[PDB]
Structures are given as structure tokens and as C-alpha cells.
Design an enzyme around this catalytic site. Structure first.
Site, mmCIF file in Angstrom:
data_model
loop_
_atom_site.group_PDB
_atom_site.id
_atom_site.type_symbol
_atom_site.label_atom_id
_atom_site.label_comp_id
_atom_site.label_asym_id
_atom_site.label_seq_id
_atom_site.Cartn_x
_atom_site.Cartn_y
_atom_site.Cartn_z
ATOM 1 N N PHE A 26 0.779 -0.831 -0.469
ATOM 2 C CA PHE A 26 -0.034 0.343 0.189
ATOM 3 C C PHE A 26 0.995 0.984 0.222
ATOM 4 O O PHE A 26 0.343 2.398 -0.609
ATOM 5 C CB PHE A 26 -1.115 -0.093 0.916
ATOM 6 C CG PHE A 26 -0.045 -0.776 2.400
ATOM 7 C CD1 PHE A 26 0.271 1.279 2.761
ATOM 8 C CD2 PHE A 26 0.296 -1.142 2.769
ATOM 9 C CE1 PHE A 26 1.391 0.910 4.083
ATOM 10 C CE2 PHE A 26 1.034 -1.045 4.587
ATOM 11 C CZ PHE A 26 1.200 -0.023 4.777
ATOM 12 N N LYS A 28 3.591 3.213 2.738
ATOM 13 C CA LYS A 28 4.750 2.891 4.360
ATOM 14 C C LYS A 28 4.432 3.570 5.568
ATOM 15 O O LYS A 28 2.667 4.890 4.991
ATOM 16 C CB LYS A 28 6.130 3.219 3.738
ATOM 17 C CG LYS A 28 6.081 4.684 3.811
ATOM 18 C CD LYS A 28 7.581 5.140 3.785
ATOM 19 C CE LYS A 28 8.677 5.021 2.328
ATOM 20 N NZ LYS A 28 9.876 5.068 1.935
ATOM 21 N N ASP A 142 -7.926 -9.941 6.592
ATOM 22 C CA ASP A 142 -6.312 -9.918 5.911
ATOM 23 C C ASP A 142 -5.701 -9.413 7.735
ATOM 24 O O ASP A 142 -4.874 -8.660 7.736
ATOM 25 C CB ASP A 142 -6.187 -8.185 5.249
ATOM 26 C CG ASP A 142 -4.205 -8.760 5.308
ATOM 27 O OD1 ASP A 142 -4.173 -9.546 4.670
ATOM 28 O OD2 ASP A 142 -4.081 -6.961 4.388
HETATM 29 O O1 E6W Z 1 2.702 2.754 14.884
HETATM 30 C C1 E6W Z 1 1.528 2.022 14.146
HETATM 31 N N1 E6W Z 1 0.208 2.981 14.112
HETATM 32 C C2 E6W Z 1 -0.906 2.534 13.648
HETATM 33 C C3 E6W Z 1 0.237 1.986 12.728
HETATM 34 C C4 E6W Z 1 -0.351 1.192 11.478
HETATM 35 C C5 E6W Z 1 0.516 0.180 11.053
HETATM 36 C C6 E6W Z 1 1.990 0.460 10.686
HETATM 37 C C7 E6W Z 1 2.577 -0.919 10.685
HETATM 38 C C8 E6W Z 1 2.557 -1.593 9.691
HETATM 39 C C9 E6W Z 1 1.656 -2.590 9.716
HETATM 40 C C10 E6W Z 1 2.042 -3.428 8.726
HETATM 41 C C11 E6W Z 1 3.107 -3.310 7.171
HETATM 42 C C12 E6W Z 1 4.105 -1.942 6.940
HETATM 43 C C13 E6W Z 1 3.588 -1.335 8.006
HETATM 44 C C14 E6W Z 1 3.831 -0.389 11.590
HETATM 45 BR BR1 E6W Z 1 5.180 -1.517 11.439
HETATM 46 N N2 E6W Z 1 3.741 0.505 12.656
HETATM 47 C C15 E6W Z 1 1.926 0.786 12.199
HETATM 48 C C16 E6W Z 1 1.439 1.590 13.304
#
Ligand code: E6W
Ligand code: BR
Ligand code: NA
Length: 336
Positions: A26, A28, A142
Site C-alpha cells: 500500500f 509505508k 487480512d
Molecule cells: O505505529 C503504528 N500505529 C498505527 C500503525 C499502522 C501500521 C503500522 C505498521 C505496518 C504494518 C504492516 C505493514 C507495514 C507497516 C507499523 Br510497523 N507500524 C504501524 C502503525
């Protein structure tokens, strides 16, 4: 995206990028300093300027306004969305800042499993959180370890003589669930393909239609991965995936086989899979019946495996619901 997601860049005249937390299909997620809110750190999801991801981001924003309004205190541990904006044609969604994903914690710790008492707490929270979605006519679709994040990922670290390696021990195993861009309401269009392959339910693979139970399947896969420290269905081939399932769980139900549109996987209503081919011998030697993965016969391990087995019921109409899962004996040690 590379031109606007660098350390030091400022978004919306407010959020200063610190570094990247993770990348996905999607776009980053970056950690930022919120210069309006006295320097508080937040997470900003920067979405690719590509139709399918724009659409998913718009859908996520709607789902989260609904969930965060219904549960303003995050009792049910869905991530809190703070705001969204556009920056150089990219949709950006601001969230509360969380720690490492459960996946990254495993990877950084050398693909070692979590301790059972942590798994118990994490599992209970995951089930509670997703059950809240299921109570509100939603299916996530997911769920995967990358989408389950520790509230805080701080750890203590010591040499462990037993495995002759340094080892990180998680301090607080509390989690939140993220990524609501695929979440689907009961009365909306269901894509034929959902979930990341490794966490995908058999009804989804077989294109039989899906609803809340497919989340339960994904959770079972996640829990076994927490227990073992590795992905249990690591293939990218659907037929091989089904073969792995049969080795771990036994044969697929005949009625599901008969109903599927994916005739290509079968021949005379059995999986079209040569057990003595190269790929076939590998599946036999690497996979094995579910209970043989247990690392202890202690009753608490048995309880977890009973729950996982019920989550990995092939027939979604028979699969345990998260409501029932929350009452399972594996969780008795959490309760007064
Ligand atoms: O600290 C966060 N607060 C909401 C959030 C949403 C997605 C993320 C991610 C994430 C998850 C899956 C793939 C790529 C990145 C990270 Br690692 N940290 C996140 C946060
Ligand atoms: Br992460
Ligand atoms: Na799967």
C-alpha cells in the site's frame, strides 16, 4: 513516494518524519513528530497514489471513524485514527504510534516463538478485538502477524545457556489490531480473493464465499505461528497450500470440494497432488499432523492446541466463533 517520505520531511505543515516503521504493498508507515501537539510522536500511513490503494485507504478511514466512534476508549483494541490529509497527491492517515508488529518482533528475535503466557494474553486480546468487529457486521479479512502490533515492544535481553544465544523477552505483550483497508461489511460486495495467502481460509482458496469465519481461520494460523516462531503454510502456490493443509489437518470435506469453482485443484473430488513428486515429498517431511507440532504435553499446551484445532476447522459453518473462543479453557488462567 520516495521524494516525500524521507527523514526530516514535513507533512501538512505539522508532522516531521523521523523514520520508516514499515512498508507494504500500500505504501509505508512513518513515525512523525507532531509539532502542533507539543512534539508527540505519531504514525502516519502514506498511501501510494494508485487507485486500488487510494480506494482501500478511503474505505479504512470510513471503517475507523465508525469503530473509533463506537469504542472511543479502544476497549476492544482497534487502532485509533487521529486524522487524515493529502500530501503531494498521497492520502495520509495519522494514527496513534504503536511499537513493533508481532511479525517484526519474531523476526528480530531470530524467529523464536513467544512464551505461552504471552500467547495466552495476546490471543485473548486478538479474539476480543476481532469479535468486536464481528459484532458490528464486519470481517477484517487480512489478519496476519504484521497487522497485530504491540502497544509497546520494549524487551529485556539476556544470554540463555539452554539455546546458547542471546534472547529478547517481551516486557508487555498488550496488542492492537491495524489495517482496516480490506475490512468488509456484511452487506457489501465480497471480493473473491481476500487475506494474505498464508493466512487465507480454505473457503476463500476454494472461492466458496466467506464471512466472519475466515477471520477465525487466520487467527488460528497466527497463533500457531506465535507458538512455533514460523509460518505454518509458507508456500505461494494454492494447490501446495491445500496439500499442506491435508497433511496437517486431514482431508478436506467432500461437500466443499464438490461445491468449488476451482476444479483445477481436484480430480475425481480429491486433491490433484502427487505425494511422490518432489514438491510432494517435501510437503510430507516438512508438514505433519497438527498435534505433533506441540513442544510439550503439558495441559496448557493441549488447551492451546484444542483451540487452534477448532479455529482450523475446514467447514466455516462448523468453525468456532470468536464469542465461543473467548470462553475456551486456554483462557481460564486470565480470569479471576
Ligand atoms: O505505529 C503504528 N500505529 C498505527 C500503525 C499502522 C501500521 C503500522 C505498521 C505496518 C504494518 C504492516 C505493514 C507495514 C507497516 C507499523 Br510497523 N507500524 C504501524 C502503525
Ligand atoms: Br513493525
Ligand atoms: Na491458511
Amino acid at each position: 513516494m520516495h521524494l516525500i517520505c524521507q527523514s526530516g520531511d514535513v507533512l501538512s505543515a505539522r508532522y516531521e518524519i523521523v523514520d520508516t516503521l514499515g512498508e507494504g504493498a500500500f505504501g509505508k508507515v512513518v513515525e512523525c513528530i507532531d509539532h502542533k501537539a507539543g512534539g508527540r510522536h505519531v504514525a502516519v500511513k502514506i498511501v501510494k497514489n494508485v487507485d486500488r490503494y487510494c480506494e482501500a485507504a478511503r474505505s479504512e478511514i470510513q471503517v475507523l471513524e465508525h469503530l473509533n466512534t463506537t469504542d472511543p476508549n479502544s476497549t476492544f483494541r482497534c487502532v485509533q485514527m487521529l486524522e487524515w490529509f493529502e500530501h503531494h497527491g498521497h492520502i495520509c492517515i495519522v494514527f496513534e504510534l504503536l511499537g513493533l508488529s508481532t511479525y517484526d518482533f519474531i523476526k528480530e528475535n531470530g524467529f523464536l516463538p513467544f512464551r505461552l503466557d504471552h500467547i495466552r494474553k495476546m490471543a485473548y486480546q486478538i479474539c476480543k478485538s476481532v469479535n468486536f468487529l464481528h459484532s458490528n457486521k464486519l470481517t477484517h479479512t487480512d489478519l496476519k502477524p504484521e497487522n497485530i502490533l504491540f502497544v509497546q515492544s520494549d524487551y529485556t535481553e539476556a544470554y540463555n545457556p539452554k539455546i546458547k544465544r542471546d534472547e529478547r523477552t517481551l516486557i508487555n505483550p498488550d496488542i492492537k489490531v491495524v489495517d482496516f483497508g480490506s475490512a468488509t461489511y456484511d452487506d457489501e460486495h465480497h471480493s473473491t480473493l481476500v487475506s494474505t495467502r498464508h493466512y487465507r481460509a480454505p473457503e476463500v482458496i476454494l472461492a466458496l464465499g466467506w464471512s466472519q469465519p475466515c477471520d477465525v481461520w487466520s487467527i488460528g494460523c497466527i497463533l500457531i505461528e506465535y507458538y512455533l516462531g514460523f509460518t505454518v503454510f509458507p508456500t505461494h502456490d494454492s494447490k501446495e497450500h491445500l496439500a499442506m493443509m491435508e497433511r496437517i489437518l486431514g482431508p478436506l470435506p467432500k461437500h466443499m470440494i464438490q461445491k468449488t469453482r476451482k476444479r483445477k485443484y481436484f480430480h475425481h473430488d480429491r486433491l490433484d497432488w502427487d505425494e511422490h513428486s518432489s514438491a510432494g515429498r517435501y510437503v510430507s517431511r516438512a508438514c505433519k499432523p497438527l498435534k505433533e507440532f506441540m513442544l510439550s504435553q503439558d495441559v496448557e499446551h493441549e488447551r492451546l492446541f484444542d483451540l487452534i484445532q477448532k479455529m482450523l476447522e475446514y467447514d466455516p459453518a462448523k468453525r468456532i466463533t470468536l464469542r465461543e473462543a473467548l470462553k475456551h479453557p486456554f483462557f481460564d488462567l486470565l480470569k479471576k
